[PDB]
Amino acid sequence: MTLPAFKAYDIRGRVPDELNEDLARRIGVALAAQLDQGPVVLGHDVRLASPALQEALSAGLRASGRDVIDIGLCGTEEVYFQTDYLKAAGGVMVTASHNPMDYNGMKLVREQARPISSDTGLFAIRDTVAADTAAPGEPTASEQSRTDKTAYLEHLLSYVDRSTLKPLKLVVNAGNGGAGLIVDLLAPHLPFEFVRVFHEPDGNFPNGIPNPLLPENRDATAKAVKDNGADFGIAWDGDFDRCFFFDHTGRFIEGYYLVGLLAQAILAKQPGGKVVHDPRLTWNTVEQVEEAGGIPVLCKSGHAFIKEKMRSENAVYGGEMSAHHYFREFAYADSGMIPWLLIAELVSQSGRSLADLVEARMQKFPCSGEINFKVADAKASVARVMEHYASLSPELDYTDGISADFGQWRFNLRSSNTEPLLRLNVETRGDAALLETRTQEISNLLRG
Ligand SMILES: [Mg+2]
């Protein structure tokens, strides 16, 4: 067998049986063998085990002659930004993002914060670590502490015209992850009044693990927006590379609609640019990008595909319906901070509420949201769906699972490559009744 903690795109596992300090040190040794010349940036999140795992990673890297740049407690996007900004050979973020408290992990990048994934170095590292019975060497390189966030903060602020910002009232919900530290460092430079919910970093997570998709966690942000009359609310996952929006009514905004909104925001700054989007939900993004003078570029979902497509296209922005937003000028990386700064600027400049900015789009292209199905046989379940609809002759696309376009409605059906888990997304052309009957029909077929 193989080490279960090595996944398709990162390392994650239960501490200490799936991930521990010895494994972390061996990963540092293995990573040093995979990178071009240069130092390695290390950062970590608020989880209790994260500092010790980072220190073991540093020990392995320095045993292999790599200088380490320790940027300390941070978000995942800061490892991306500093790896690129400091022209490092690579970087590692120690984080489990949104997983349970006994879990941790790592996200690995090389030069320019390019992802290291299972087929681009991560499984080479796994097998090296798995075979490594060598004695731990001693450090032949130094660690430098570099916690200065000035360049990162200046970069974030460069996305908005601060003289155009209004003193909006914004709920911010770090979920006791790390986002509140960055909010507080941005605040002196912004006119907003912040309503801070679950703000203090606490790896014990007394208010729940940081996952704004859980309805109970969703409701703390919604309640703060409604009780304070806030313009909108923002919540983050624990390492805040994902953000989530709540309009002034407390309504959680489905991430699909943020792709089109942010693309229009960016295209006003970078006219004629290309915008990369995923295949799960498409019609609204294609229309909004084209109306703003941009060029939409379809791409398989998952950050490694999006980033490499953005690079090959010189795309200014990429967005996934699942709360991932990527920016060319940000090393083609994802940020949970840039998106809400852009949205706050859009609300400020337009005089429109976030609710009204998305309302007509939600009416024009209603969607199901992503619906997950644990099935006995994913391949047979997909076959049942496709056989049922064969007589309607949908237009089929295989960019990412199966996309089927029927004219006034479409769906995307994708398989989990690890667990027998299908993911369904449906959308229609302004027809909520059709959305529900087709969603339920597909659901019945999948469960059959
Ligand atoms: Mg995350």
Author numbering: 1 to 448
Task: Please quote the paper that reports this structure.
The reaction mechanism of the α-D-phosphohexomutases is conserved, and entails two phosphoryl transfers [Fig. 1(a)], with the initial transfer occurring from a phosphoserine residue of the enzyme to a monophosphorylated sugar to form a bisphosphorylated intermediate (e.g., glucose 1,6-bisphosphate or G16P).
Overall, the structures of EP and EdeP are very similar, with a Cα root-mean-square deviation (RMSD) between polypeptide backbones of 0.26 Å. A structural shift of loop (i) between EP and EdeP has not been observed in other enzymes in the superfamily, although only a few have been crystallized in both states. In PC1, a distinct separation is seen between the two apo structures (triangles) and the ligand complexes (circles).
